[PDB]
Amino acid sequence: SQIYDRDSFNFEIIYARFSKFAKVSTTMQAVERSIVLKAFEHLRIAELIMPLTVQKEFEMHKLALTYSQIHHCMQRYQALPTEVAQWAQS
Amino acid sequence: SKGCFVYKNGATRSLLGKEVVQQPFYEEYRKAWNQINDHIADLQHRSYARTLEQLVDFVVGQAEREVLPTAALLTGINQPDHLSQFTALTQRLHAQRAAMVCVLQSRDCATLKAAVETLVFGLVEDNAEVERLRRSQCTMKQLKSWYTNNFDSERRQLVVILPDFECFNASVLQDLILILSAHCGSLPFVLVLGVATAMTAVHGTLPYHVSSKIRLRVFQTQAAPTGLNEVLDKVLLSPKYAFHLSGKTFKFLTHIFLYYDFSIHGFIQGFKYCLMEHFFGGNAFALCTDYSKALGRIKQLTHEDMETIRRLPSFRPYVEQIIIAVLTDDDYLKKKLPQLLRDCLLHFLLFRCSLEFLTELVGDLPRCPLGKLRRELYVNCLNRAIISTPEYKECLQMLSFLSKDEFVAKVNRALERTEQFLVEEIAPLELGEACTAVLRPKLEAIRLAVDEVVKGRALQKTLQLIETQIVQDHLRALQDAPPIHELFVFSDIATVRRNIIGAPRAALHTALNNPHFYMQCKCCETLPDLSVVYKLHLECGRMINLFDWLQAFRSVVPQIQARFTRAVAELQFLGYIKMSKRKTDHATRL
Amino acid sequence: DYEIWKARMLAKAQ
Amino acid sequence: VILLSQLPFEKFYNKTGLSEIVCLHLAQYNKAETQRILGSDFQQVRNQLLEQKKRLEICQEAVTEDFYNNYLNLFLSVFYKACRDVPELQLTARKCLSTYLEPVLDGSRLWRHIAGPLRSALTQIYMRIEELPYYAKFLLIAAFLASHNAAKQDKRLFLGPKSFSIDRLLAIFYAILEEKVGLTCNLLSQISTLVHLNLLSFVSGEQNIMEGSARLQCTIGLEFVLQIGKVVGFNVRQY
Amino acid sequence: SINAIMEEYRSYFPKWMCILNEGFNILLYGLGSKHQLLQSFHREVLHKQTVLVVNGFFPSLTIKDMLDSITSDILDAGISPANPHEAVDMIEEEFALIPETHLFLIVHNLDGAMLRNVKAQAILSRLARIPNIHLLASIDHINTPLLWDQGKLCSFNFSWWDCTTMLPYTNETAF
DNA sequence: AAAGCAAGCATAAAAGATCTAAACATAAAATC
DNA sequence: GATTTTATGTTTAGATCTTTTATGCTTGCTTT
């Protein structure tokens, strides 16, 4: 939503954007579609993502945060792996 | 003016007359078909008994015991075959008296309130049925007060079958599993899921948290093709029933099972329709039974049964190969009847044991082009003479390339299989000692050929004795069958396919293309008014500019507009077209 | 056909 | 009146407003504290392992406190990135201790033997475990083709999944069938059974399904429809 | 032409009765009107039996009128409960106690405009699933079995019969 | 020539807002 | 005094009127 400027997203587009990182991570190679799908539904049920109001994997969605919250939670997080921080600076 | 009409006569709070139920053919059909239905039912129960005892043991082991226990059961894609199975499960939990159970079908769960009220009402009414409170009052709290009001000094389990897990709306189902998770510990719950597909549906439909609060364990009932294989090997090809299907109808029934629907019950209904369509030609078709009662019916027959025996086509070669009192005075034919019926039932018993020996021989071989299952060799054998088929030629080619020791071991396993069939199935049946008396010397001949193979060119002698002693005499084609086997076979696929497979599309099209196929016109082989408009819009494309189409109708044949608008009204009643919603006086083909 | 077979076999067997 | 949820309170407001409330946050545990939680139950899990005699003779001598702490570090080295949900870590940690203990029942010297199965155990997180007719296979294949290969590519072969009317489904079924079956009642019944089993889904047109205006939506990923084209043997990647 | 096929349709009637005796449910699927033939069956062998004529092509025929007609005019047990599923549960347990209380229903047009929803056909499928009651139905629309899945088609123990006069649709457009 | 994007358009369905018909539980009185 | 019955006030679910939006479809311009 920063590159396409706050357009709605989906599990498969974010799955492509995540699997671009997963195959070069050498710490996230072991996760599958299933654990990421559980993480996506868990992000939905804590209301960090809201439906735009079909498959469970193919709803349209919207982010619920301003970017300063995400940029702050990268800082205040404890023991974040550095590869995700290098993705955060990209 | 009414939408419904009644013609009630004498009702307060066996359709057929005496003239048919008196006749032997209905009694024979009910006896044979009831034996069929009881056999396939006990077979389904014995195949189910492992899963059913595992389910009852799971319920009792949870009674031996908050995340609720639950046991999914991977039922097949069809429904009605499992239903009686579930009812038997309820009877087991009312046999040991440790659980009461309400089915929770998806029709009752349009909302969470409806789900909770049908759950509580079904539990309290199941408990009353083992031994009328308000629909607006039956909350979960009343269920808790009622359970501690009754069951505490003993702990009966609270079972909720969900036969159609797929059919539920996801939100009411997640809320219901969350509510039952909230009340477990205080109320001993178990939940069983009838998932019609696979485990991915359970892992996908249940959300992160509903799966976090569930404890599921999977049991598997047998698959439908496996069930048709067991029903076909063990009942319809079991020797002891006298009624054998033709290879065409057999292939058509296993075709409808394997290509369209996994309906074991649909296979049972098709076989019952075949039994009815064969048996309901008169009392003469009710000679097709066990041999002694067949002799009693031989004495019983009248004169119409003589005519419905004598016109049967396979009796025709028997008179070709040769008696004046046999063809008119009836009773001499009645005395010749035990010879023909006895040789025919003897031929079918020899066909069944020889078919067992052949499928035991071919099934151990690699590739098995003929097939590794008895129904496949059965339809290939009754369809045509097997020796003229390319497939038997490929089988004897790959069978003639065998190593000699694996050959003698394979034929030895086939000998053990055929002797087990001879001691374990044909032996109770009447005319069973005669068939082992016939086939046993040929089995001795293949036995001595085995003993000399134990001691290159010898396998050709074994194949020649297999063709002479078994394949030619007792594995004959349906045309090569012994005469008046027409009583004992059902070759008529035409009425069964036009009365079981419904083709509304083909019926409407063959009405609208070839009316003479229905109407029996002497001239139209004068046209019906619908057919010209059907031919004209079939000529037309997607959208219909209605006035050019109407001008083509004016050209081919005022009141012409009335016949045309009447035809388009009958056409849009049939669903072939629809009038355009964007544009009045215009049409669209569908 | 039933009829030609009827004539043939009631001429032959009868 | 205590309330409990995962949402922050700011989701809860309405157009009339609410009175005062005492907000209170519970932070989820960092990895050392999750190790302390899972290590608190060491006495119960030892008394459970004593229940099930050379193996009990080595269980009583080598299921001690620091061994369980090393096992907990060896487990939270793996699953902590995937979940911090403490009940799931308990529920999986006990089973992985049950499969972990075999080569100290016999004779680190263990991280390879369990790091094998642990990366299979990660694949079965959250999930809690302890066929089709031939023409229905072709109908599910044609449904995936109608709901993935767009509305305009199909002239030359013959954003998410796209909804589709059923006459498109019967047209792709005719094109892919290469035998041309008659349109029996059983085939349209097979359509309605793929509807009822959640292999297809409805979005609109439910009141006039027989009119053909209803919009359907195939719901299957690439892997299982490739398994269908494998068990038929008919490849679907050509279209 | 038409009279010949109509008399040939009348010749099938005792075999239709034997088919109905075994639990099958007759289902015509012709192009023309099935009205005159089914009325001929209602007169010619159904002069005495409990016939429930149902014109399903009626613009305003609710399923509830059929439910109340079955639970009232025949079984004399008053009005049906408001939910159709509890209503057919009541009809089922009411019919469970009464063997030899045989009855027939004759549904013109299963594909009728109010019956075209899946819920009315599910109520009909639960209705014909009773061993006692028996059903004779007509069909006209080319796309009717889109709403009959295999469960409802198994409960609808049909025996199809191509009964096709070339009759004009007169009652079908009268309503 | 047709293929694809576009102004619009026209019904459709999806809340949703609000009201009415059927159900239904309760109060109260008639009667045994 | 207890039961029953039924008359009625209340509830609840469906029916219907807005209106939104909206999206498949019309068709029409434009373009390769």
Author numbering:
A (entry chain D): 358 to 410, 420 to 456
B (entry chain C): 8 to 20, 38 to 89, 94 to 159, 177 to 199, 202 to 369, 375 to 507, 562 to 631, 641 to 672, ...
C (entry chain F): 224 to 237
D (entry chain E): 155 to 206, 211 to 265, 273 to 295, 320 to 347, 375 to 455
E (entry chain B): 328 to 502
Give sentences from the paper.
The loading of ring-shaped, replicative helicases onto DNA constitutes a key event during the initiation of chromosomal DNA replication. In Orc1–5, the AAA+ modules are augmented by a C-terminal HTH domain of the winged-helix (WH) type and co-assemble into a pentameric ring that can exist in both open (active) or closed (autoinhibited) configurations. Structural studies have revealed that the initiator binds DNA in the center of the ORC ring, bending DNA to prepare origins for Mcm2–7 recruitment and loading. To resolve these outstanding questions, we determined cryo-EM structures of DNA-bound Drosophila ORC (DmORC) assemblies in the presence and absence of the co-loader Cdc6.
Importantly, we observe a similar DNA configuration and DNA interactions in a ~3.9 Å resolution cryo-EM structure of a binary DmORC·DNA complex reconstituted in the absence of Cdc6, indicating that Cdc6 binding does not substantially remodel ORC–DNA contacts. The main difference between both structures pertains to the Orc2 WH domain, which is not visible in DmORC·DNA. By contrast, more extensive remodeling is observed in the ORC ring during DNA binding to the initiator when comparing structures of DNA-free, active DmORC and DmORC·DNA. Surprisingly, Cdc6 binding does not remodel ORC–DNA contacts or alter DmORC’s ATPase activity, nor does it induce major conformational changes in the ORC ring apart from providing an interaction surface for the Orc2 WH domain, which is flexible in Cdc6′s absence. These findings indicate that Cdc6 predominantly has a structural role during Mcm2–7 loading. As Cdc6 binding to DmORC·DNA does not alter how the initiator engages DNA, these binding assays report on ORC–DNA contacts in both the binary and ternary complexes. By comparison, the β-hairpin of Orc3 and the WH-helix 2 of Orc5 only moderately contribute to stabilizing DmORC on DNA, with triple mutations of basic residues (Orc3K710A/R711A/K712A or Orc5K341A/K344A/R345A) decreasing DmORC’s affinity for DNA by only 2–3 fold. These biochemical data are congruent with the multivalent protein/DNA interactions observed in both DmORC·DNA and DmORC·DNA·Cdc6 cryo-EM structures, and also uncover the B-loop in Orc1 as a DNA binding element that is essential for high-affinity interactions of DmORC with DNA in the absence and presence of Cdc6.
